[PDB]
Amino acid sequence: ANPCCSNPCQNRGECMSTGFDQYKCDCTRTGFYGENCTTPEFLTRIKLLLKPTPNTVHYILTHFKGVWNIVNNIPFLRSLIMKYVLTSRSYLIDSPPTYNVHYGYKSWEAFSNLSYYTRALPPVADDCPTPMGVKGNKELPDSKEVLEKVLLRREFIPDPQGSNMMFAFFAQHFTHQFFKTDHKRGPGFTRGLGHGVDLNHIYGETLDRQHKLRLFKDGKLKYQVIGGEVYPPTVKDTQVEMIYPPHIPENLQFAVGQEVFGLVPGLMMYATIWLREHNRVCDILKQEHPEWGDEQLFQTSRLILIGETIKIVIEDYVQHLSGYHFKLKFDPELLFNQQFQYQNRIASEFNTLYHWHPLLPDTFNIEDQEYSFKQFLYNNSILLEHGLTQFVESFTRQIAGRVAGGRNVPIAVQAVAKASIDQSREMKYQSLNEYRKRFSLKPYTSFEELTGEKEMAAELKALYSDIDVMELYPALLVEKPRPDAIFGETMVELGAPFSLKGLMGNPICSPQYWKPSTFGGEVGFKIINTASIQSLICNNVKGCPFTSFNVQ
Amino acid sequence: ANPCCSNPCQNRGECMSTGFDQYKCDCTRTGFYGENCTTPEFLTRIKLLLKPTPNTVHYILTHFKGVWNIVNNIPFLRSLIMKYVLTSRSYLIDSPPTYNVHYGYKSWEAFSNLSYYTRALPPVADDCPTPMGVKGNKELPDSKEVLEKVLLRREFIPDPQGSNMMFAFFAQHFTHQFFKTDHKRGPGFTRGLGHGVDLNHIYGETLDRQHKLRLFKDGKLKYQVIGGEVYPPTVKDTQVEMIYPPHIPENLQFAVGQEVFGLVPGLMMYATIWLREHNRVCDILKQEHPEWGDEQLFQTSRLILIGETIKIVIEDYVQHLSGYHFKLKFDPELLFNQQFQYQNRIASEFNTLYHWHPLLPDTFNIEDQEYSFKQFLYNNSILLEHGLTQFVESFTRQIAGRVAGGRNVPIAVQAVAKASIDQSREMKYQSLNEYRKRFSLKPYTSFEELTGEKEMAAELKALYSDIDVMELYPALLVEKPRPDAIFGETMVELGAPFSLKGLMGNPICSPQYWKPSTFGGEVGFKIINTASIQSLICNNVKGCPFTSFNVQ
């Protein structure tokens, strides 16, 4: 019924109904005009001939390594390239945010209600003839059928970029501070009201939780010493709610910021490392400021760890997955003379694309042992048995799975991969091609072009009929990877701008925050600016074991 | 004890303790260096020798009528000048925000907790020897004494600028959407989580309250007809909580967005006008979009009214209190190529300086009647008796009281003016001169330079002894006003930046919002852009009576 169901507005034009069977396209500031904002202005014609494709740019960043090695060693040259890539990755995100699962038009409710994930593309209206709007059939192909045919893992396909379990678990741990779906409400709702990197997965979402986690001495978090090693406190000791199955003994119910971090020992490992990191910084700050109270030590350390997190995420985590020869740089100063909004809102699509479950192995290898999922899940005994050092050493050695390329979702979490598909439909996601146009990519003209092969393509062809009906979530997982890369084109081009706004949009990056006195002075500022995944592990894990996000 | 108690760091440098009896100034990006950030850098002396004083600028804006009349009728020039005021007023407010009542240093608690008012200056530390830091006596002079001797009104002092009661009530009605102190928590806490122009004073702070106030047909608000006139609904009809003395009959308990608006017929006047305006826009929108449902009609109307509000606030309200001959202009497009943060946090000091109770007359004059405060307060019968048209005609004629210049606070609200003193101290506000310095104003060298006279001046001298202990709030009401103006220098120079952030920081002013489709097309857009206090009253008040913020 709705005349905007076909999404006729192109180039980010906005559709608005003007009657029961007529629409209008607001082409304001798009660089295009006409009934569907398709005919381009003069200056835009120039842009479209001067800008290279993402793949073109990806090739350059992944080749000419000898050249990039020269760039990386000339500070001013490195800063200027980083400056460019920063601002080029910026025009794509609505900030302040716009739509959400309940609002396909901008509303104050959509802007003001922090309980919703935001939305890169508005939902397909409820009164549309087909799930993707007008194209395709009345009902979408069976999620089970999609899942079993092109997503499930036959045999393990290792990531060619060599991502390890330190990478996979860091990904899960890091992202789960802002991907926290409130299932009571629905899939388009979040419990992470910070909408970014606030480290609530360490400190708790609410004040009441943070206080129960706090020692209230020297600014530290409560902790216990098992054997001679520092571990999170228990639920029994702190009364902070954690999600554990009932058969788990009270002495193994470790209590941390995020309620769900008992699920995986790989999560608990990072929670443990970061807990030690917080208290280590507390000692450093106390030594610098013997006049400080508990509250200021706690607050300042938190700001520093927020800083370390952003640093490590950009210069180690994203550095690895990007595969770029260019050496990325965390430096808020690069934005101080640029137009940029120091705020962020977590997009539902960011959450959806970040379901990187194929990363997981069939078994978890920690020294001698090979644990299955059922042995691993909710088992913190394993962390105690092997200790932090063995965990880091083992995780650094174990290869993770490829995400794109299709058929790599471990069977153990098949219900999750299915849920991602159904909840995407439930939230009325537009099609894959709709999202590609929205992030300035050319739409796939066939299923074979998407996969880069033939068997999965034909398998999808018979399910979806039309390529413009292909769904976003299954696509990125089945998408033809870049050469020897973990991710395909759509994954990177969607995830990058979302991620940037997450890290860079943090208030500590704003000019009035990014100064030494914010962070207790020069030594605290130095902690943020010299942080790395290796230093994080080296300062808090006994023996200073080597680590990286890739297999050596 | 705290070595930063004396506020040693100048030019917006940040003080930090480096021990028990030592400190350090963070001069980052201040344009100054040295121990106390006082010796200017080279480029800084230029700026200092090239910028005029606020008084110099105010002079030029309030004189040369003839020249401004030419500028006003050259859209190019007018727009160019507006852009320049817009930016010259936007380097003063910390955005994202920083300090609050509980945090004299930056912390994640102060940033993320939306229940606090933010603070333009950090609070004086608790362990400081004196309320102002180190200057003055152990205890501040009796607030009752300061109240009586320099604040309370002897006889009514009219505003030379000719501000009327339409202005006074508009100031009270408008600002009370973002000045909503949660007295359960303390004076440093707000109930206005939107922290700006969200029109919650019409639609309610929460969803539950909003839905109770809605008619759920044609996007409209609930209302009743008394006589032949449209009034807000009642408490029995909507079940929304209102504040009313127990003797108020049920049929007079009017339910509006702000729970306190039933205490003043003046407030109830604007609540009624704005309620009518919303429903009016619903009629227009439904006509344009017969295919739209109740929800979209309501949300779009709300966005349009927010826009109308900002438009009227800038070009009528602020236009009048400014006294500028230059025609101010509401145009978000003027910021699009500038650096500007589309966000806002309501400062405690903005709240304090906006206590304009001297505006209130001794009696409220509606036609033949002259009501006292007792007769006026919580008396909605007065509104029903006379009607809206007469309210408008009368309040347009009645002069408001001068705010600066001392001794003009009506006795009926002496407890209010005193509370502003007590609560300022309770919130550990820094001194007047500190705030002047903070906002690039030269410190007053004597109590007589502050007041411009001698009797109040000496009166304050015997109370505060040193002018560097003069408190912010009483100073604003006792300050030497600009020539025949309602306000003094300090009032305007603190008020402007805060007010700007509040208005222009609204999300509807962001590039992605400021377009026709956001407001239902060119027609809804046109309602914002042609809005005025006169058209607001003309469209919604029977007989379309003349109105302005100035006595004719």
Ligand code: HEM
């Ligand atoms: C042993 C390892 C893992 C297990 C058992 C697991 C299992 C699950 C389950 C059951 C859910 C749905 C829970 C719910 O919605 O309440 C989920 C969601 C999710 N998973 Fe995993 N997962 C694992 C590893 C990972 C990894 C390595 C990533 C890397 C990015 C990841 C990304 C996500 C994301 C982004 C969500 C959505 C979370 C939300 O919105 O609340 N997971 N996972």
Ligand code: HEM
């Ligand atoms: C008949 C007229 C008025 C009366 C009886 C009145 C009375 C009061 C009272 C009793 C309070 C304290 C409320 C509380 O502590 O809970 C207050 C606060 C305040 N007043 Fe007024 N006032 C009037 C007019 C005005 C006007 C014309 C302005 C112009 C700006 C104004 C500005 C304010 C502000 C900004 C607050 C702080 C509000 C908050 O934080 O909740 N008032 N007034």
Ligand SMILES: *[C@@H]1O[C@H](CO)[C@@H](O[C@@H]2O[C@H](CO)[C@@H](O)[C@H](O)[C@H]2NC(C)=O)[C@H](O)[C@H]1NC(C)=O
């Ligand atoms: C915003 O800050 C306020 C002030 O601390 C927080 O309020 C307190 O909450 C704790 C329990 O969590 C109570 O014990 C205190 O009495 C509260 N303070 C009061 C009543 O002034 C509030 O929790 C913060 N808001 C959020 C959302 O964290």
Ligand SMILES: *[C@@H]1O[C@H](CO)[C@@H](O[C@@H]2O[C@H](CO)[C@@H](O)[C@H](O)[C@H]2NC(C)=O)[C@H](O)[C@H]1NC(C)=O
């Ligand atoms: C954000 O929007 C959600 C969705 O409407 C609101 O949740 C509804 O709130 C009402 C109360 O007014 C409840 O009756 C419903 O059960 C809620 N629905 C869902 C799906 O949760 C929520 O109240 C809004 N948040 C704010 C702060 O206004």
Ligand SMILES: Cc1cnc(NC(=O)C2=C(O)c3ccccc3S(=O)(=O)N2C)s1
């Ligand atoms: C699946 C993902 C693909 N890409 C990701 N993120 C980036 O590509 C990305 C960042 O996250 C980012 C962070 C800080 C500054 C700049 C960048 S980036 O240029 O957007 N880029 C590498 S996540």
Ligand SMILES: Cc1cnc(NC(=O)C2=C(O)c3ccccc3S(=O)(=O)N2C)s1
């Ligand atoms: C007591 C007050 C004194 N001044 C006030 N506000 C202004 O002076 C002011 C605005 O509020 C504002 C609004 C929108 C755009 C620009 C301006 S302003 O230049 O900061 N100015 C007149 S409030």
Ligand SMILES: CCCCCCCCO[C@@H]1O[C@H](CO)[C@@H](O)[C@H](O)[C@H]1O
């Ligand atoms: C209007 C109510 C006046 C408050 C009563 C206390 C007055 C004490 O104050 C005195 O009042 C006189 C009156 O103008 C002034 O001449 C004095 O300077 C002042 O000190």
Ligand SMILES: *[C@@H]1O[C@H](CO)[C@@H](O)[C@H](O)[C@H]1NC(C)=O
């Ligand atoms: C605009 O889109 C409609 C609907 O998809 C299509 O039928 C029409 O041909 C397009 N018109 C123009 C001028 O591009």
Ligand SMILES: *[C@@H]1O[C@H](CO)[C@@H](O)[C@H](O)[C@H]1NC(C)=O
């Ligand atoms: C949990 O892990 C421990 C590791 O010591 C293992 O012995 C045990 O079998 C596991 N429990 C389950 C239920 O798999």
Ligand SMILES: *[C@@H]1O[C@H](CO)[C@@H](O)[C@H](O)[C@H]1NC(C)=O
């Ligand atoms: C800096 O300020 C302190 C505190 O007011 C003062 O004692 C000191 O003399 C100042 N130092 C300089 C170099 O101005």
Ligand SMILES: *[C@@H]1O[C@H](CO)[C@@H](O)[C@H](O)[C@H]1NC(C)=O
């Ligand atoms: C209420 O207002 C009426 C006029 O409508 C007035 O006569 C009466 O005195 C007022 N009530 C009080 C308690 O002052």
